[PDB]
Design a protein around this nucleic acid. Structure first.
Lengths: 129, 129, 129, 129, 129, 129
RNA sequence: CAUGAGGAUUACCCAUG
RNA sequence: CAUGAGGAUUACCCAUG
RNA sequence: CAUGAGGAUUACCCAUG
RNA sequence: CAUGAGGAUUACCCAUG
């Protein structure tokens, strides 16, 4: 085994999928990037630290770019018009068993499932009401 | 589309599901909690704001109880040993269309999909290797 | 659901009832007022705060006015001769389950039931003896 | 009308009722307690005074025990995790007649009547939404 | 119950309608925003405060954008060519009954009804003549 | 042709209507006043100016009185117990075509249509909730 | 290290403790 | 934030810690 | 907090009281 | 002239730039 593998970040149903692959592990930060120039790539990073005597903290980051072609000094360069960022920190007590952790994973999946409140608000540029 | 409604946070196959329901709306911060004491409840809060002239920011927090060896309705101290905290911040530039935001939601779903690196690590009390 | 609804504050048996309706939620303070000028209205406010690491505190206020018509500078204005105020604070530990909380509600209802000591003293402008 | 008597604080339908009885009268502060250790008892205290030239003030305090997972007669620490505190202050201008005061009692009963917003929120470990 | 809901700001029949939805309600300022790019969205805000002892004051704001596409260096972004701003303050004495407030609303609707002097002037880039 | 004419400010059907008529147009400020005592009359004013190189600005004001009779020393005068004041500024860039201005007017009418959030709050002495 | 419905051009910065 | 059988013209103020 | 037919890039900025 | 969820007794007054 080894869980540092590539995966589908954006599932557009087999055609136009955004897959992301392992690209670096320097300084304890696992990194993944899509097959693009570094200026237009999707990026995912993850690190874990024992943040206290009794806690462990996962720091995860995702960068979603809006690709574009920009003319700088008369020449065309592949660039990112802008980027959206997701920063998440998860603090889990050292007393959580594997089944306690599975519960946390399920909660995160349920939180973002299509049709639920939060993903619905975000996708519609709206708040909760 | 009034989206502030009850939803399934933890899908256990219909039996043993954890539903979370609207519980507070003070200050634009929407809150949902499971049917438990507040010390053992599943809690979800969400809010949106314009962080700067160029960005909007969603702050989403989730609290998940440690269940193994839990005494339902009891007093469990210290609090930090029985609870996990998830803090998510999503920064989206003001130029993002609904389509752009839909793709951002897909990226979040893909990141946590069953079998992928991040959720596998978290569920196995592991890091990346 | 949504518990921010209108309700009968003073039950004079269907004729002369004082109902109070939602009127504001600015700054996390839920407000209710009767259908009157703001100078003669009954008023109810409620807010909840996590006042400590392990407590939650409800702050509730009720204003009962003595309506009157006052001549100021030769003109008649709807005003309140005086007002009676009820301020209550309820501190509940985060360890209280839903059934523990129902117990608190029942205790408050029993405290004020017709015929019992406290409501009897108040209604008679007397103390307890 | 000597009103300092025993009364039913928690009405559970005749079976499992909680009666509270006169227990102290030191300094004009009337007290009632249930038949329990003082750490697990239901306590009610009440006093009246002339707070200023224009007002009279009733101070009513209620203490309710957390019952779920309670060990009858046992030592439960910390105290703050096993008890809820209600503090009520009622300010009534000296011009209030008995009729005025009767209406004030009705407002308090209406505020806490079953099904209304405030008691529903409290009983469901919720706020207003 | 809630009035912090979605509503039609611009009625262009059944199709082409501009709907504005709740987004944030921080510090007493309710805000509504239309869908899609925040940069090209319609915005409405509202708040109320006790400006003095006798007056309450509403502050309402509306922004109408002129949708356009910006192209800089070959990179196009959805923007607002410019915006029209509406700022209105409404002072209402605390003596106003509900009947009085309904009349105030009728006056506001009448001031802007099709065919009347003011909306006709505005709609035609004109003044009074 | 002229838009400085008489118009219905308050439409109470066909009878009880408040009509306001032209009175003065000095220094770029058009003014309309209802009939009878100036002291109890409704007032509307309007003006436009080039606030800067790119913007034109409308300043509209409305006064709604509460009719009352004042009695001082046995001498009664028709007066206004108090007044409600509406002040609105509308900034419209010089690039706005007539089509753009019609949309701005529709937004203003939509903001105040019966049933929508803002007029409902005002009509009920309420804020947003 | 800790907290922030703190910010960012995102493995950085700020405030508080 | 905490306490007061502290006050008020009641979402404020005071004293103590 | 109050006034402005004060301005704006619109919950900000200015003058006066 | 510009900004203020600044106030008013509302074409006035204030603060800031």
């Amino acid at each position: 085994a080894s869980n540092f593998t590539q995966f589908v970040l954006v599932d557009n149903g087999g055609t136009g999928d955004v897959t992301v692959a392992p690209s670096n592990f320097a300084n304890g930060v696992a990194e993944w990037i899509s097959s693009n120039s570094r200026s237009q790539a999707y990026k995912v990073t993850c690190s874990v630290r024992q943040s206290s005597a009794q806690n462990r903290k996962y720091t995860i980051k995702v960068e979603v770019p809006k690709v574009a072609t920009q003319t700088v000094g008369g020449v065309e360069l592949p660039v990112a018009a802008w980027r959206s960022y997701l920063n998440m920190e998860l603090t889990i007590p050292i007393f959580a068993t594997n089944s306690d952790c599975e519960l946390i994973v399920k909660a995160m999946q349920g939180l973002l499932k299509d049709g639920n409140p939060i993903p619905s608000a975000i996708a519609a540029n709206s708040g909760i009401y």
